[PDB]
Design a protein around this ligand. Structure first.
Ligand SMILES: CC(=O)N[C@H]1[C@H]([C@H](O)[C@H](O)CO)O[C@@](O)(C(=O)O)C[C@@H]1O
Ligand SMILES: *[C@@H]1O[C@H](CO)[C@@H](O)[C@H](O)[C@H]1NC(C)=O
Ligand SMILES: *[C@@H]1O[C@H](CO)[C@@H](O)[C@H](O)[C@H]1NC(C)=O
Lengths: 172, 319
């Protein structure tokens, strides 16, 4: 996709993540853990289910049309009737083919983007207390217990609490 | 300087392939088929009103052929017309067959209004052995075969019906074509015959055609059918010196015609669906279908592709 996150600097997805589209995986002194991120997940789902509903929306409520099947040829009038229907079908088949390719191209960019927004959100939370390792992971330069980790995941992490410890670990 | 937090996304073991602008095989976590490629092996009698022609196509039903009696008073959104329908009456043709058939189907109902036509000295109610109705020589119950006197005489007919009702009327009339020159004269005195049906702003003149055709139901004679529409405030004139197949009345035309006809052998079932193909009803929310271009009602659009998958999830990169 356009942002280079999914199938990009994030090498692969997590089959272990079953209650979310995006999430956090951590490691600290007291262990490891995987947790879903609801906001990013819901944003992606909203945009895709939004597509779906605009798709299944359409009437096409047609009754009396024209004859479309013929036993034997009659000539001019039949030629036109067949040509009209054939022309219609080709145009609608093209529409269908293009629509799906456009939607899918966009859906993939949207999900790639939402992955990247999550990463960027966490990056900004951490300020100077962490460094991008390059694989979608941050090295955190201070002790971060389970409550610290959760504070990062739910947006309450206060970088000033650990900044002195982090700055010292980073540069010395 | 050792804890690590990683941001990631889900994956499954095996996703679904989709197409984009660039790639025709991209694996994504979930996807949704947009082309309906399964139909029901039956037609759904609701919410649309289906009327089964059974043994009668819609022309025969309008003419009132033997076996088409059930179609009387019938009202339909979609007239179901069977491929194995059979002619059970006098051999005929319609010059603008598909056009009459279209008008009848679109109209959506068989509401006949009987009317009195005091013809002449003529024998009325002529019948035939090609149109047997339980053992007995009979005829199209909407038509009236006019054929001359006991005293060898059918003068000029010339009757007028003035439409001062609030609906347009459909009159179906015909012209009989004899086989030789012994023929007509002993069915129709005069030679040549001729019919002139007209309104204030229209007309139609037919000269009968004598010649011998193959024998169909034991006859080489034919009837050609025509129609005339009479708007409120207009009228109609039946002028004849022979060979007229008179009408017994008129069909009522709806002001607005929303119905149609579907030709198929598929049986009518118990399901509920508002979309009917000649292969059967569709039960679906998908926007497209590849089942048949012949589709009536509230249907997905017909396309050539057998499948079109919409991505409903991100790229799938497992492990
Ligand atoms: C009104 C009338 O008398 N019709 C007669 C017809 C017609 O004269 C011819 O069919 C014209 O082609 O001929 C019959 O043999 C028939 O078809 O059963 C007997 C029938 O009574
Ligand atoms: C009969 O024909 C005459 C002229 O031939 C016409 O004036 C008259 O309106 C016609 N009447 C009917 C009842 O058809
Ligand atoms: C419609 O598509 C299906 C596959 O989705 C295919 O099996 C079927 O033959 C197609 N019908 C056609 C081409 O009439």
């Amino acid at each position: 996709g356009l942002f280079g996150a999914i199938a990009g600097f994030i090498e692969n997805g997590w089959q272990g993540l079953i209650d979310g589209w995006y999430g956090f995986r951590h490691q600290n002194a007291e262990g490891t853990g995987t947790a879903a991120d609801l906001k990013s997940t819901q944003a992606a789902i909203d945009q895709i289910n939004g597509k779906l509903n605009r798709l299944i929306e359409k009437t096409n409520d047609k009754y009396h049309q024209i004859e479309k099947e013929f036993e034997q040829v009659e000539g001019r009038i039949q030629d036109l009737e067949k040509y009209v229907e054939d022309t219609k079908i080709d145009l609608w088949s093209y529409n269908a083919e293009l629509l799906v390719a456009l939607e899918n191209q966009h859906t993939i960019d949207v999900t790639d983007s939402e992955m990247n927004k999550l990463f960027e959100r966490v990056r900004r939370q951490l300020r100077e207390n962490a460094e991008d390792k390059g694989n979608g992971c941050f090295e955190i330069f201070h002790k971060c217990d389970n409550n610290c980790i959760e504070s990062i995941r739910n947006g309450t992490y206060d970088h000033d609490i650990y900044r002195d410890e982090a700055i010292n670990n980073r540069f010395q | 300087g050792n804890p690590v937090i990683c941001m990631g996304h889900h994956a499954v073991a095996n996703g679904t392939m989709v197409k984009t602008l660039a790639d025709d095989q991209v694996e994504v976590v979930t996807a949704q088929e947009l082309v309906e490629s399964q139909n029901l092996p039956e037609l759904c009698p609701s919410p649309l009103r289906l009327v089964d022609g059974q043994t009668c196509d819609i022309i025969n039903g309008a003419l009132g052929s033997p076996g088409c009696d059930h179609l009387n008073g019938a009202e339909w959104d979609v007239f179901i017309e069977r491929p194995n329908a059979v002619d059970t009456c006098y051999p005929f043709d319609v010059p603008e067959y598909q056009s009459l058939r279209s008008i009848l189907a679109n109209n959506g109902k068989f509401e006949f209004i009987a009317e009195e036509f005091q013809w002449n000295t003529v024998k009325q109610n002529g019948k035939s052995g090609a149109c047997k109705r339980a053992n007995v020589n009979d005829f199209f119950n909407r038509l009236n075969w006019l054929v001359k006197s006991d005293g060898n005489a059918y003068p000029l007919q010339n009757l007028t019906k003035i439409n001062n009702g609030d609906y347009a009327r459909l009159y179906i009339w015909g012209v009989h074509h004899p086989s030789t020159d012994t023929e007509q004269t002993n069915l129709y005195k005069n030679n040549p015959g001729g019919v002139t049906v007209s309104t204030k702003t229209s007309q139609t003149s037919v000269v009968p055609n004598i010649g011998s055709r193959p024998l169909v139901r034991g006859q080489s004679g034919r009837v050609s059918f025509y129609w005339t529409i009479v708007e409120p405030g207009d009228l109609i004139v039946f002028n004849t010196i022979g060979n007229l197949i008179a009408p017994r009345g008129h069909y009522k035309l709806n002001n607005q015609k929303k119905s149609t006809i579907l030709n198929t052998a598929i049986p009518i079932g118990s399901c509920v669906s508002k979309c009917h193909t000649d292969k059967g009803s569709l039960s679906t929310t998908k926007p497209f279908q590849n089942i048949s271009r012949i589709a009536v009602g509230d249907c997905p659009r017909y396309v050539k592709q057998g499948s079109l998958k919409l991505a409903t999830g991100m790229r799938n990169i497992p492990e």
